[PDB]
Design a protein around this ligand. Sequence first.
Ligand SMILES: [Mg+2]
Ligand SMILES: [Mg+2]
Ligand SMILES: [Mg+2]
Ligand SMILES: [Mg+2]
Ligand SMILES: [Mg+2]
Ligand SMILES: [Mg+2]
Lengths: 105, 129, 87, 97, 287, 250
Amino acid sequence: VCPPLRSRAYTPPEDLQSRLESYVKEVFLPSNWQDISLEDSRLKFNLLAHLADDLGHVVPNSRLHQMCRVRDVLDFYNVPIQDRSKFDELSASNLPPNLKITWSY
Amino acid sequence: FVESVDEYQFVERLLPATRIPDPPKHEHYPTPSGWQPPRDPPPNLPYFVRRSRMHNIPVYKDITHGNRQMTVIRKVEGDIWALQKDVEDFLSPLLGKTPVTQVNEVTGTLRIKGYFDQELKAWLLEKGF
Amino acid sequence: YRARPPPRRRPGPRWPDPEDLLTPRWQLGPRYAAKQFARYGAASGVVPGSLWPSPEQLRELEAEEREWYPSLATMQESLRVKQLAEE
Amino acid sequence: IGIRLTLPPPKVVDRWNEKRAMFGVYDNIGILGNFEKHPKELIRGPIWLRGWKGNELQRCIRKRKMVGSRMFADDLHNLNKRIRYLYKHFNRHGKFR
Amino acid sequence: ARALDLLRGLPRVSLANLKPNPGSKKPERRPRGRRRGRKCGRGHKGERQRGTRPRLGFEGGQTPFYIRIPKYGFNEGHSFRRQYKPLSLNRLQYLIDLGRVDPSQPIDLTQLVNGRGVTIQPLKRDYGVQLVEEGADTFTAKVNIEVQLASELAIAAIEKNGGVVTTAFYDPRSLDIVCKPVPFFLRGQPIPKRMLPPEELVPYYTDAKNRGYLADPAKFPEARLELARKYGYILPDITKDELFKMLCTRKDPRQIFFGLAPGWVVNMADKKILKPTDENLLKYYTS
Amino acid sequence: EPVLRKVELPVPTHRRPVQAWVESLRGFEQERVGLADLHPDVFATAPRLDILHQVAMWQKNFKRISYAKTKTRAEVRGGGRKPWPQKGTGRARHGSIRSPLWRGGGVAHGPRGPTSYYYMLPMKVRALGLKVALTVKLAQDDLHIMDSLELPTGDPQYLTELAHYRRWGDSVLLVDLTHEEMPQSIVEATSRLKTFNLIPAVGLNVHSMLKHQTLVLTLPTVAFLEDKLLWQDSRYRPLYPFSLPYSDFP
Ligand SMILES: [Mg+2]
Ligand SMILES: [Mg+2]
Ligand SMILES: [Mg+2]
Ligand SMILES: [Mg+2]
Ligand SMILES: [Mg+2]
Ligand SMILES: [Mg+2]
């Protein structure tokens, strides 16, 4: 049975650095954990899979190679993505009173 | 009448290879033919010039109309514009004017008006590509 | 859908029936058999002894060699007599 | 009046029938199958132009050479006449020399 | 690369997005409209507009240029002239340096072709490879090379480096087999005898100054010393070299490949070599 | 246990292998069962859409044989005699009733016989087209790597629902290594579907990769494609067709 479709909307959590460093400690320690290199496949998979399970939002294959460091992972996860259609993006954008938009699709 | 045998080593010797062999390690460079492997590690320039499948610098003379002489640096990766700036800086003292060039960003090539294949090959060797 | 099975070369030697009129004449001679043996070896079923010339073929080859390819001694003698005549 | 007064019956195309869906499959049979088969061997058509291309004269010459003996009598006569005409046209007519 | 990030931004690449590279598709010109119609680029009435202008080379009745010039034997016998692809010492050194040709083994036309150092076309009357002195002053390889022609300077360079060079003849059939042995092996034929040089070429290949493969080996040291004296280098005693056996290895004058005798059949399918034992066949293939 | 794939072939020093999630078809949620390193020279080449167009057009047109044919004035029935004399009738001059000007006459420049459109791009160009298509799918997030194509069931509804849940495209091209070893479950599931098409690795091509919105590859297919496409790089100029024996070529 198909589960309810996962909404692609994602708002980065406020305690995101804390959660990320907790996961980094769980997976891997030294000072400046931002600069920990993910050249190891095991460690990269563990960290990214944990983050994907926890936040409901995975790094796409296209961006997977540019996650060279925990800093890169943090940058990827602190950028929001909204799944609202263009209809919503326009209508909920403070339309002037003389502008009317309707969608029949 | 028929006598089979296994002297097949002399046939394995005749079988040709489909893959270009990696050049053997030489004690001293440049090699007697002038060839030189790319330096390890690669230079940290914004651009990289990959060797040809025969392990030579991809710099080629080209000619059109019988009078338009050009030189092409072909297998460029990264900042082709940085490479163009470097090539202009390196070639302007030789010409006395900034060389006229075309940057094919799509194909990753740089085309320079005039023949500079030898100078550009030496220059790329010095840069370590 | 599922793709149809990929096209492949017919495995092993291909022996056309000589009785058929539509089989090309080049697929019936000994050269075809020799090529089949070279391509598939023992699996061809070609008797290896047939690859070498039969005694009549060998006699023809020897006659052709005697006729057209002189020995090194004969060539040297002809060159020597030509040089002597020129001198 | 050279225009139809009604809309033609709608033309429905199934973009995902088996032929369209599997179009192109095995076009790389050579470079992905150790070159056992050439992609031109995938071509189905007249025996005289499988994996081959030419102008009309070359096509007609090839057709006569390869299946001329199997051609019907008047078809072969037409092909012979066509080859003769095409020879004259391609070797004696035209803007260029 | 930034281009792949741009792709990530852009819509899906499909069969509705494809466009040829600009400049790779010239527009088709067809004779319709004011500019390209009417007379359609053919001009006013005449032979050229009718399409019936006379053949190329016709000059309107004046005796044509290509006929009023006297016949001269520039190309007489062109298809029977022997051609030899040049292999400069520069090219040989380049191949050895890049490892495409292995100097530790005897170098023959098969090895040159397999390393792609030379391209031989027996159908175009190539009779093999000629060694070329170009690059002699920088040749520093010890090699045992078998060529068809060799210049005096090329021989001198090869021998000064401590190597050996021999000029060996190949008839067109043997040459084709040597250049592409695998197709010959797939032909399923016994390896034929290498024919002797034609009478005109016999003195060349029996002369020791050319290092001919049919020359008296007794005269080789004298010729080598003469070259060393002429070109001012000390002749190295290759017998002392540890690779002397390789440098001495030479195929029999009737032998196409180094380790294969005439008459053998190479079964590549099961990695075997069938050898005839009939006395008549053995005599023929040894003759 | 993560399924990690490393790049078997040597990678250029200045380049780092690109990466993809190894997924599974065994469950709707099994979107990350491993991590695969893909060769950048196959999966991170330059985005040559022009080369994609070249290869796609070659695929469309090289097999084409048009069977359209018209009769010329020589082949139309009849038309031997001159209809009327040159002068006297007051009518236009004509030589046969089958000239192109006439109703029922020949066609002056119609299609002529079965015509082939056959041509071959260089095999290096065709392999490069395959590489570019793979890089494009990966960069646009249409490429999904699977450990295997094994399904819990051969029900097509399961496959369609799995694609819908994982937000795959309307069309999926699943590629398995060889025809024989393809799992029976995926074979049964895809045999009944129109937009989910399953092909062997040897059947991969630019046209089908572009027709299908998403491309699903197994790890053996990834290794196989890397080997085959990278072989085109660093290969010699052929001495004879590669079907013939070579020292190092299977
Ligand atoms: Mg050019
Ligand atoms: Mg005008
Ligand atoms: Mg007119
Ligand atoms: Mg006029
Ligand atoms: Mg008629
Ligand atoms: Mg009609």
